[PDB]
Amino acid sequence: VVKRTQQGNYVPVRPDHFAGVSVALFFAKAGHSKCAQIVPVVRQFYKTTNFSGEKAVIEIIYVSLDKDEQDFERVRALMPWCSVEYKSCLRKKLIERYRVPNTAIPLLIVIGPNGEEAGRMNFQQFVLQRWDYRFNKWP
């Protein structure tokens, strides 16, 4: 129901994949000016922070406010973390829940095991580091 990547065919992620990691929701829409410079820095942070441990410690869920399925697909083709299908209703419920208008985007919300909000950081202007992976360990 929620999607991880694989080249050639699209594979869904396990619900037990998120065990013991910290999950950050990442809001972006393609063609937006600020999203194009928020994507690469959080890409580099994903790679560096999560791929020294033999156990991965973070996870980033991609939510797109795009207007087109093909545009969302071509930006998923650049996104190395996990995302969600466009036709599913979870993206719509999540954006209507976590208070994201359609210049606040892009923004990040680290959550907890219950899914309720544990921390908010925006990018309106070195702020990616304010999140610590040691905060939201899950059982």
Partner: protein, 426 residues
């Protein structure tokens, strides 16, 4: 961080600078609409050297466009990559500095200094703390050499310790435009020796000679002439913007190139320059690039470097090249061209390696050197000025404007002594 503030002045400088932000934005990956594209973190982590973020996520260049004739600013807007600049940064004029150096500097030169210094002050103080001031202008025309050169002197008294550089074109040796060039260049050289840190000379007839041989182009417009000068422009500030194996700054290039406070005029060179036919049959190697380094037919300057000894030269290599093959080739070019260097300085070459080649190419190098053969334009323009002034020609639109004959005799005494010190050191 450190940010360079850009000044585009004169008819020539506004066209060269238009091609400057043309070539910087697409190697940094910013669309003419200002948005970023490319998804490469190295292109982004130092973008504030030339850009300011605009609270829409878009960028705006830190360039101030300044002239006294309103046509060329509308030309820059109408061109591509022309919507990047801020309309408040445009400071037009309406009289037109009619190629009279006095009136670009005093008569209607003074009435835009208030507006152009006010907008550069707003740019300068809002930042972290700046580094330097690159300006693009011309020493032949009037508003390039009056209006911008007064912007030199008013800024340098305002910030005395910061660096600033000029990429100025010069009067051509063979055929000149704007027939009062000898008055213009000599009256602008004795403001540059007092108030400029490095003056990188471009000469127009040599640029055509580059399009004669090393490119074998047929019909070069002012697009690709300015496009190749912009390549040298991007090379000197390449090493600030990007990391590398041996990083070098604009001020660090000035530390080791200017041996004495006066002689700071620089011959520029760019390699590779290949014809399109020979582009397939050519090995692009560090010992091969270093031979177009010391090619007299490759320099952007018009002088013949073989008639003098370089005092100090620097080479900003770009790309993923081996460090040994660099510094040995610098010693290779020094030992066999021993008669073409000066002897009372050991190990004259400076080299600096970045790790980012320019777009569309694998390896490049920008040459910035200090020759004693640059005395030719300081001698050929000199006896041009002393010839006309001996029969007092054309001076009545200077003497009728405010400059009397004390500074003209002073101005030649500045520049011919500059010929004397260059000859003193050889």
């Amino acid at each position: 961080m450190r940010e360079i503030v850009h000044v585009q002045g004169g008819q020539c400088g506004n066209q060269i600078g238009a091609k400057f932000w043309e070539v910087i934005s697409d190697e940094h990956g910013i669309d003419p609409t200002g948005t970023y594209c490319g998804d490469s973190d190295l292109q982004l982590e130092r973008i504030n050297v030339f850009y300011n973020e605009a609270t829409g996520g878009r960028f705006v260049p830190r360039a101030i466009l300044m002239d006294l004739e309103p046509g060329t600013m509308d030309s820059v807007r109408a061109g591509p990559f022309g919507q990047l600049f801020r309309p408040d940064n445009f400071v037009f004029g309406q009289t037109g500095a009619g190629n009279n150096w006095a009136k670009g500097h005093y008569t209607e030169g003074a009435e835009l200094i208030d507006s152009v210094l006010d907008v550069v002050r707003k740019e300068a103080e809002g930042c972290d703390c700046l580094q330097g001031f690159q300006i693009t202008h011309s020493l032949g025309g009037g508003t390039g050499s009056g209006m911008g050169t007064l912007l030199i002197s008013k800024v340098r008294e305002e910030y005395p310790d910061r660096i600033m550089e000029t990429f100025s074109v010069f009067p051509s040796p063979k055929v000149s435009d704007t027939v009062v060039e000898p008055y213009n260049a000599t009256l602008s050289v004795h403001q540059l020796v007092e108030n400029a840190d490095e003056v990188q000379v471009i000469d127009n007839e040599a640029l055509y000679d580059i399009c004669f041989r090393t490119l074998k182009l047929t019909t070069p417009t002012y697009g690709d002439l300015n496009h190749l000068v912009s390549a040298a422009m991007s090379g000197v500030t390449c090493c600030l913007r990007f990391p590398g194996q041996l990083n070098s700054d604009l001020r660090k290039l000035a530390v080791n190139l200017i041996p004495f406070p006066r002689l700071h005029f620089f011959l520029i060179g760019f390699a590779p320059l290949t014809s399109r036919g020979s582009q397939q049959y050519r090995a692009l190697s560090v010992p091969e690039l270093t031979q177009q380094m010391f090619d007299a037919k490759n320099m952007m300057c018009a002088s013949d470097p073989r008639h003098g000894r370089y005092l100090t030269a620097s080479a900003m290599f770009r790309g993923r090249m081996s460090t040994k093959e660099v510094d040995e080739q610098m010693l290779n070019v020094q030992n066999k061209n021993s008669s073409y260097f000066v002897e009372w300085i050991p190990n004259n070459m400076k080299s600096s390696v970045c790790d980012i080649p320019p777009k569309g190419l694998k390896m490049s190098v920008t040459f910035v050197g200090n020759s004693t053969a640059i005395q030719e334009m300081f001698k050929r323009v000199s006896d041009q000025f002393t010839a006309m002034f001996r029969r007092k020609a054309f001076l009545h639109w200077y003497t009728g404007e405010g400059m009397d004959e004390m500074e003209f005799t002073e101005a030649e005494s500045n520049m011919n002594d500059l010929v004397s010190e260059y000859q003193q050191y050889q």
